[PDB]
Structure formats: structure tokens, C-alpha cells
Amino acid sequence: QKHLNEKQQENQDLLVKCISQNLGYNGDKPVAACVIYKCLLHWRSFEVERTSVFDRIIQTIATAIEVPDNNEVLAYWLSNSATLLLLLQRTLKATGAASLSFLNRQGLTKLDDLRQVEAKYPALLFKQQLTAFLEKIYGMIRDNLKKEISPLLGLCIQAPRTSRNAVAQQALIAHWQSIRKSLNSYLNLMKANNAPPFLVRKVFTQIFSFINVQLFNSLLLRRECCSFSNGEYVKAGLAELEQWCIEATDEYAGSAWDELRHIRQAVGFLVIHQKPKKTLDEITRELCPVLSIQQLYRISTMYWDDKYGTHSVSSDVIANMRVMMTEDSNNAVSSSFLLDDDSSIPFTVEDISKSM
């Protein structure tokens, strides 16, 4: 008789209520992912041809993250989704086209050495749906951080206009420190939720990409930002962000510092002494090897200085830049001018599993 459909709904209703609560962590392992996995392994839910269990897990995570100020619940479900997908990745064998007081017997995060099960269609859809939610959650954490440091960069770029004394300049240096605090908040929130360092390395690398774009684009498009004094101010800012990368360490920072290679080199140009004495070859290969000719030309021709009264690169250097741009223009070769950030998903479930 169909008294199994009532016991199965009761069991699913139970799991939903457990994973709706904060189950926190045991050792450095997310508990909800381990509780979910074991129930599905116990019930053999990976081997059933039809079931609601997977849908209800997805609905629970979906209902949890889609609330206002979702940073804590997002960091939580990032760490859990990553661990659950890692287990699913090493468990579910592909089939078809692609070719609650039983948990008291042992520790929740201590799991019997993973054994492969030939997953049925509900289970293969779940891995795909859970993958999509990891990417969505990752995206929301990153984009939430972008939205928080966007207004601070907004004030960093307005520093020339804000300076219509040393106190006023130091008040604008504080904005770089405000960004460093926001970076550390999200770092500590993901460390508290034992987010796999690999995934955290991606977030900050993609965020420093965003910073590099916002600052470098303002040099190209804002005359007032293309000055010696603004070169000094930004160089001060880069020292704050470099310090954050050292404190965070390469384990959590990744190559976030190397994502600023454009703005670093551009600022390196703006502050260099005796620009008129420099050759085009020095500028393009010793100072700004990552910058395009079209970028250098804009910076070189828009450069001004009402502080030290220093001049730009020589007219002979600006002449050699203009010919190179018509050379490239004649070949219909699209050259880099404005930068764009990395808003892509920079990982696959295999990459996540390959590490840790």
C-alpha cells in the first residue's frame, strides 16, 4: 500500500526543518551538507526514479538566501553547497544520456569512505541544480561586496573634485581604509563559515579586477584624475590594498594584487620624474608593459600638474604613439582602451573537488 508516500513526506519534512536551522560546523566541515548527504545515502534517494527530496533541499536553500542582508546565510550556504557538491561529484555515477535518529550512531561530519552509486535522473538534475545555486550564491557574495565598495571608490575618484590642507587629503586617504575594512569583513565572514580557501581566492581576485577597472578607467575618462597629485593619492591607496593582500595571505588573496597591474603601472607613470627625458621604449616595456598604446596616449595627452608643474612625455614620443594607433587602425585591430571586470564564474565543480 502507499503508506510509503506519507513516511517519505514525513522524512523530507524532518530534513527541511533540520537544514532550516543553523547546524553550524564540526571540526572545519559544514554539518547540513553532511546531514543531507547521509539521509540521501540512508534512504538510497540517489537510486530512486522519482522523489521530492532534492526539490525540497533546493527550495530550502533558495528561500534562505533570497532575504534582505543575506551575507551570513550566503556564506553559510556557499560552504555547505561546496562540500555537498564535492561529495556528489565523488559519488554519483552518470546514467542514461550522459554516457531521523539513525544519525546518532556516529559523528555527523565523520562519513563512511565514499562509495560510487549509479545515480537516477532526479539525483543527476539535483547535482546540476545545486551547481547552479553554488554559482548564484558565489555571484551574490561577490556582487554584494562590489555594491559595498562601489561608493567608496566613487569617493576615491572624486578626490580631485573634493580638493576644490594635509587634514582634507588624509580624510580622503580614509576611504582606502574603509575599503580595506569591507574586504576584511567578507574575508572573516567566509573564514567563520570555513569557506574553501580556493573559492575565497576567486571572489577577491574578481573583486580586485573590479577595483583595477574603476580606478584605471577614471584615469582615461576624467581629466582631473590624470594628474601628478592624483597619482600620489592613488599610490597611497594601492599601499593599503597591498597590505590587505599580505595580511590575508596568498591562501585567501590569491593573485588579487596582480589584478591591479594596470592601475599600478598607470599610477607608476603619473608619479615618474622627468617624463620629457623618457623614450617611448622605456615607457612601454620598463614602466607600463601591460598598458596599450591607445591607453598611454590618452594618459600622456590628458596629463596636467598644478602642484609641481611637471610636463608630460616629449612631443616626439606622442608623435610615435599617434602613428602606432593609425597602424593598428589600418589593420582593423581592436586595441584595449577602457577595462572590463571579471563577472564570469571562474570555477567548475571538478576544480573545487580537485583542491581540498
Read out DSSP for 90-116?
HHEEP-TT---TTGGGS-TT-------
The answer to whether 131 touches 81, Cβ cutoff 8 Å, is: no
Nearest to 175 by CA among 241, 228, 225: 241
Q: Residue 319 is inside which H or E element, if any?
A: helix 315-330
Contacts of 196 (CB under 8 A, 6+ apart): 79, 82, 352, 355, 356
Question: Nearest CA to 300 among 266, 261, 336, 265?
Answer: 266
Which method, experimentally, gave rise to this model? Answer: X-ray
Question: E strands, 51-153, where?
Answer: 92-93, 117-118
Which residues make beta-bridge pairs with 29?
Answer: 26
- Counting DSSP H helices and E strands in the chain, the numbers are 15, 4
Instruction: Judge contact between 42 and 100, C-beta under 8 A.
Output: no
Single out the residue of 62, 64, 69, 59 nearest to residue 23, CA to CA: 64
- Quick one: CA dihedral 62, 64, 67, 68, positive or negative? negative
* 265/287 Cα distance (integer angstroms): 6
Three-state SS for 183?
helix
> Å resolution of this model?
2.3
CB atoms within 10 A of CB 35: 20
In SS3 terms, 188-227 reads as HHHHHCCCCHHHHHHHHHHHHHHHHHHHHHHHHHCHHHCE
How do 25-26 and 92-93 pair as beta strands? unpaired
Breaks after residues in the chain, judged by C–N over 2.5 Å: 99, 164
Distances from the Cα of 203 to the Cα of 67, 85, 185, angstroms: 21, 19, 13
Q: Cell numbers of 310, please?
A: 611637471
**Pairing mode of beta strands 29-30, 117-118:** unpaired
Class of residue 222 by CB neighbours under 10 A (exposed 0-12, middle 13-18, buried 19+) = middle
**Residue with cell string 592613488:** 234
Report the run of H or E that residue 295 belongs to, with start and end: helix 293-302
Cα angle 13, 15, 18 (rounded to 5 degrees) comes to 110
Query: Is there a contact between 267 and 235 (Cβ–Cβ < 8 Å)?
Result: yes
| Element holding 29 (H helix, E strand) | strand 29-30
Q: How many CB atoms lie within 10 A of CB 33?
A: 25
User: Cell for 336?
Assistant: 584595449
φ/ψ of 150, rounded to 5, equals: -65, -50
First to last CA, the chain: 46
Please give the single-letter amino acid code of residue 166.
A
| Of the candidates 162, 190, 186, the residue with the CA atom closest to the CA atom of residue 174 | 162
Q: What are phi and psi of 199, to 5 degrees?
A: -65, -35
Measured CA to CA in angstroms, residue 72 lies from 153, 195, 255 at distances of 24, 12, 25
Dmax (CA) for the chain in angstroms is 92
d(CA 349, CA 292): 35
Q: Cα(233)–Cα(302) distance, rounded to whole angstroms?
A: 18
